[PDB]
């Protein structure tokens, strides 16, 4: 068999500052735009209090891809982008990684490597206008498809026939923008819903924003478990004489393995080496002679 020690204690460290941030400021908003404006907010520099979303039962399901929704409270991010656009709530299927659809081919595009949430839910009176709905309008067919996460502010009349349609609408000439004329007492099932996209960036920088988890103290000279802001591992932490330059956070070795770490609160240098393991070998004479054994830990 194989031999390997188990950790005894566990340590979690991430920077001291918390600064509870207003997730709901984009949820309890004033007005929304259809497809042209979504304000590309950058909620960050805080602690992600995702508990504010699943405590209320008046929402749709956390139907999104990349991370298990219940696990969203134990991930540590770098930058979060919230997309605020509102579209029909019975047509809310085109917002998925790599799916077709007209709004999914000449409007907002999600990438095929979308590692973020697309949480969306109902809208009853806040979105639906009082005494007629004429403002929430979306642009019609475009020249071609658009690149993911790209704005489409530029507007111009499409020309494919003999008419440039420069204010001469009619007689085989069209203008994409038109008034819907939605009176209130209509098919509320057709009412647009609140659609938000919370993209995640697990790519570039050491983690900066994450939940209210509690930070313990430091343990030394012990095969230990640790979570220094994403840098998970199993090993022994001794203070090493590696002279970090200020901007440097992690440490890596010849074969691209994590080797040295600094504390996100105390700035102390530390390193990482696997705690002892190996194989176990049994030494014995033939069982026909005696039943004694000697054992070796490789």
């Amino acid at each position: 068999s194989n031999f390997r020690v188990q950790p005894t204690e566990s340590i979690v460290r991430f920077p001291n500052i918390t600064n509870l941030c207003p997730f709901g400021e984009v949820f309890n908003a004033t007005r929304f735009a259809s497809v042209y404006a979504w304000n590309r907010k950058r909620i960050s520099n805080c602690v992600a209090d995702y508990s504010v979303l699943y405590n209320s039962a008046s929402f749709s399901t956390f139907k999104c891809y990349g991370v298990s929704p219940t696990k969203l409270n134990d991930l540590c991010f770098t930058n979060v982008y919230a997309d605020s656009f509102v579209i029909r709530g019975d047509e809310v299927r085109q917002i998925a990684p790599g799916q077709t659809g007209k709004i999914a081919d000449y409007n907002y595009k999600l990438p095929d490597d979308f590692t973020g949430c697309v949480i969306a839910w109902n809208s009853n009176n806040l979105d639906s206008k009082v005494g007629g709905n004429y403002n929430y309008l979306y642009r019609l067919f475009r020249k071609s498809n658009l690149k993911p996460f790209e704005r489409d502010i530029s507007t111009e009349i499409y020309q494919a026939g003999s008419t440039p349609c420069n204010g001469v609408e009619g007689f085989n000439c069209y203008f994409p923008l038109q008034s819907y004329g939605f009176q209130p007492t209509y098919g509320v099932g057709y009412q647009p819903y609140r659609v938000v996209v919370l993209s995640f960036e697990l790519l570039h920088a050491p983690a900066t924003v994450c939940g209210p988890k509690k930070s313990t103290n430091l343990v030394k000279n012990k095969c230990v478990n640790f979570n220094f802001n994403g840098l998970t591992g199993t090993g022994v932490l001794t203070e090493s004489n590696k002279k970090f330059l200020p901007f440097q956070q992690f440490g890596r070795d010849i074969d691209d393995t994590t080797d040295a770490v600094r504390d996100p609160q105390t700035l102390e240098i530390l390193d990482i080496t696997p705690c002892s393991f190996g194989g176990v070998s049994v030494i014995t004479p033939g069982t026909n002679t005696s039943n004694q054994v000697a054992v070796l830990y490789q």
Binding site: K242, L245, F250
Partner: peptide, 11 residues
């Protein structure tokens, strides 16, 4: 310039 913040040595 240094590409990323990761410290290294003799590599």
């Amino acid at each position: 310039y240094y590409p990323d913040k990761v410290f290294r040595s003799s590599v």
